[PDB]
Amino acid sequence: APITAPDITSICKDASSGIGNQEGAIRTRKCCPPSLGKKIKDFQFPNDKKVRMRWPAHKGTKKQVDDYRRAIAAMRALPDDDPRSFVSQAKIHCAYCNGGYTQVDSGFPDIDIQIHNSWLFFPFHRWYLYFYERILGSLIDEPNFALPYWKWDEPKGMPISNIFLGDASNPLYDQYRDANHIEDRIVDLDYDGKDKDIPDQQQVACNLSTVYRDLVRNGVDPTSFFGGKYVAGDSPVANGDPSVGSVEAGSHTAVHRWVGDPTQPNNEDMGNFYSAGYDPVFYIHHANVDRMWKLWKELRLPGHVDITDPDWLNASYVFYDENKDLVRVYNKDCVNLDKLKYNFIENSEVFPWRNSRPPQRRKSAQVATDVKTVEQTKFPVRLNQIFKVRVKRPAVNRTEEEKDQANEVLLIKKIKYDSGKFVKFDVFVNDKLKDGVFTTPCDPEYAGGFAQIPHNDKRSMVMTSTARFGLNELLEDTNTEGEEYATVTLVPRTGCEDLTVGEIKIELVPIPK
Ligand SMILES: [Cu+2]
Ligand SMILES: [Cu+2]
Numbered sequence: 001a002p003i004t005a006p007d008i009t010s011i012c013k014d015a016s017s018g019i020g021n022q023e024g025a026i027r028t029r030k031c032c033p034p035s036l037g038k039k040i041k042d043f044q045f046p047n048d049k050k051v052r053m054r055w056p057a058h059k060g061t062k063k064q065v066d067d068y069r070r071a072i073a074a075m076r077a078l079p080d081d082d083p084r085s086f087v088s089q090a091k092i093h094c095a096y097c098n099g100g101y102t103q104v105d106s107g108f109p110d111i112d113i114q115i116h117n118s119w120l121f122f123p124f125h126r127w128y129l130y131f132y133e134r135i136l137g138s139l140i141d142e143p144n145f146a147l148p149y150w151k152w153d154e155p156k157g158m159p160i161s162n163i164f165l166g167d168a169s170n171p172l173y174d175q176y177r178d179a180n181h182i183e184d185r186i187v188d189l190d191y192d193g194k195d196k197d198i199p200d201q202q203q204v205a206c207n208l209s210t211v212y213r214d215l216v217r218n219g220v221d222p223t224s225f226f227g228g229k230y231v232a233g234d235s236p237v238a239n240g241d242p243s244v245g246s247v248e249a250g251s252h253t254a255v256h257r258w259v260g261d262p263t264q265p266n267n268e269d270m271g272n273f274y275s276a277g278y279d280p281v282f283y284i285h286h287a288n289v290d291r292m293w294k295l296w297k298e299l300r301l302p303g304h305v306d307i308t309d310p311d312w313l314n315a316s317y318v319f320y321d322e323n324k325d326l327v328r329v330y331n332k333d334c335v336n337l338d339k340l341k342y343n344f345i346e347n348s349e350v351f352p353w354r355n356s357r358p359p360q361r362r363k364s365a366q367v368a369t370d371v372k373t374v375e376q377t378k379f380p381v382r383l384n385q386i387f388k389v390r391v392k393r394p395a396v397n398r399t400e401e402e403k404d405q406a407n408e409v410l411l412i413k414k415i416k417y418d419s420g421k422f423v424k425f426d427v428f429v430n431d432k433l434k435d436g437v438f439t440t441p442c443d444p445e446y447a448g449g450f451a452q453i454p455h456n457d458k459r460s461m462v463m464t465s466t467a468r469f470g471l472n473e474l475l476e477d478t479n480t481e482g483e484e485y486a487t488v489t490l491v492p493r494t495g496c497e498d499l500t501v502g503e504i505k506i507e508l509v510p511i512p513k
Contacts, residue, residue: 001232002314003113003120006105008095009035009326015098017112018273018455020420021265026176027275031094033320034083040318040326045339050144052133052342054291057148057161057284065163068148071136072171072280083320084135090277092128096317097273099458106232116273116455117465118230118242119222119312122293123331125286130340131319131327132283138322149287149344152255153211153295153353155204158186160259164281174279176261176269189251190441190449191258192424192493202440209442210251211353215296218246218448220407220470221303221512225296228466231311236457240414240464246448247292249467253451255285257422266454267422273453291344294337295351302404303511306335358444361478365437371487380414380500383425383492387501390485394508397482406508408471410447410488414502419456419463423495424449427469430478431489444477449493464502471506 012032019025055064078085095101099112115124129147137145151157164172165182180195181187186203188196189210196203219225228242259281260271269279276282297304307313313332321327337343373390381387394408410429417423431445447469456463475481486506492499 001106002311002316003103003230003232004105004315005113005317005328006101007040008033008101008318009038011102011104012095012100013102015094015100015274016458017099017114018419018453019098019266020454020456024265025274026264026268027094027278028091029094029098029274031091031098031100031274033091033095034081034088036083036324038324038326040328043327043329043333045333046134046341048143048341051338052144052146054146054149054287054342054344056151056154056157056345057163058151058157058159060148060163064146064148067140067142067145068136069163069171071140071142071145074139075136076171083324084139084322086278088320089132089135090275092319093277093282094274096124097455103232108233111233111235112458114236114455115317116248116453117244118228119226119245119307120230120315120331121227121245121248122290123315123334124317126290126293126334127317127319127329129283129286129290130334130342131321133342135322146342147287148284149291150255150281150284151288152187152189152207152251153288153292153351155208155352158204158207159184160187160281164284172280174269174281176264176275176279177259178261179263181258187255188258189254191254192426192449192451193257193422194494196441198441205356206440206442208353208356209358210254212356213448214246214250215292215299215353216301216357217470217473218250218468219296219304220409220472221509222305222307224409224468224470225304226307229309229311236463237460241466243466243468244450244452246468247289249451250448252289253453256453257451259285271422271453273455294344302513303407305512307331357473358442358446358477360476361444363479365434366432366479367434369432373485374504380416380502383490383496383499383501385492387490388487389504390487391504391506393484393486393506396484403472404511406510408475408506409509410469410471410486410504410506412450412467412469412490412501412504415450415465415467415499416462416502417452417465417495417499418461419452419454421454421495422452423499424451424493425496425499426491426493427467428489428491429469429471429474430480430483430487432487444474447471447474
């Protein structure tokens with residue numbers, strides 16, 4: 001029962017999800033696409049001669065930048081009614097991420113479609129950028145046109161590229177950005193709403209670890225990387241969201257909240273799904289998120305495999321192409337970049353984040369072990385303060401052979417909260433440092449976090465979610481592979497006043513091959 005986008009030009013409604021303040025929304029909620037009386041045709045693979053090479057936004061040639069600027073300028077010049085227009089392209093994101101469509105074609109007209117918070121996250125945005133990229137190319141007669149990508153997994157590429165800065169005369173410019181972050185400032189891939197008073201050196205090191213954390217530590221298998229299973233009939237109210245992937249809830253979300261203008265009602269443009277598409281950097285951010293998918297597989301680590309579930313493969317969306325034709329595309333058809341005739345320009349060397357595993361904790365920095373166990377704790381627990389609890393592990397002292405067959409994964413389920421605002425809390429495991437020990441935002445005890453852009457549903461006031469954290473490296477890094485219990489510490493960062501956690505448990509997840 002795969003999620004199937006309906007006739008988007010026939011069945012559509014104004015965005016009513018993930019927008020905390022609709023009264024005063026600076027951008028429109030009328031995200032329905034133009035009706036040009038076109039029939040939805042099946043997708044056909046491109047016959048391009050050369051492969052479109054996407055370039056780092058901070059290492060672009062004069063031609064690459066000018067072509068990109070001229071292309072956006074052309075897109076901004078089109079009428080709003082045009083499917084290829086700047087406004088229309090932005091509305092695509094709004095329609096799919098803020099309840100524009102329903103699962104009516106699958107027989108559930110009372111259930112909205114949400115590409116986010118699911119395994120549809122990566123493939124959707126790949127198709128999104130795919131048509132977006134080919135549209136820009138055709139508007140300037142560049143058959144070999146290629147988008148840039150925000151290479152924030154590389155130090156010199158972490159600050160916003162200056163090509164997006166300046167003033168309104170620049171097509172790539174957007175006034176609706178965080179003023180405190182547009183001054184050549186380094187991005188925080190683990191942003192929680194408040195700037196950190198740490199050196200640039202520390203921030204880069206933590207950014208590199210965040211990439212490693214999202215692609216290696218927590219991206220241990222397809223479920224934890226792409227996101228949870230999401231089939232037709234699935235409602236966010238009955239019951240909750242498909243667990244969110246490591247990238248989506250991690251570095252991806254961080255950039256959205258870091259770029260978005262906090263002075264605006266819904267943190268427009270980037271800070272919210274419904275308005276993100278109005279900022280040119282949005283597509284360039286997702287160009288690298290799209291690249292994380294590529295890198296995640298090129299690591300060729302165990303468990304880093306493609307999805308084979310037919311419910312994923314047969315899931316489909318609808319887009320307008322450069323010829324204003326309605327095209328239905330399937331997830332199965334975007335797994336191969338060679339077939340889509342594009343790729344990314346890499347440094348010919350080793351990725352700077354490849355070895356950004358947190359440093360081993362010294363036993364001399366740790367003390368011996370009073371925290372209650374799950375059996376002693378009354379759930380659900382509310383995270384309006386730091387919460388500590390000991391969780392029984394599924395095993396202890398696993399051999400190297402055992403760890404290569406299954407991941408020890410911490411599962412935090414039934415996370416209920418008002419999704420009208422941005423939510424984030426951090427997760428630390430086996431924290432037992434002595435007093436006076438120096439700490440960093442990228443310590444080994446840090447398992448990562450659960451961050452959520454507002455995506456509150458139309459007919460519920462509360463959304464439910466799930467997070468997955470890999471412990472194979474962490475337990476080693478903390479010298480606690482032998483301990484029967486794992487002390488899990490949940491630290492709220494923002495929007496956790498009403499947040500509650502329903503269940504916490506550690507399980508062995510077999511590595512798929
Ligand atoms: Cu999105
Ligand atoms: Cu995004």
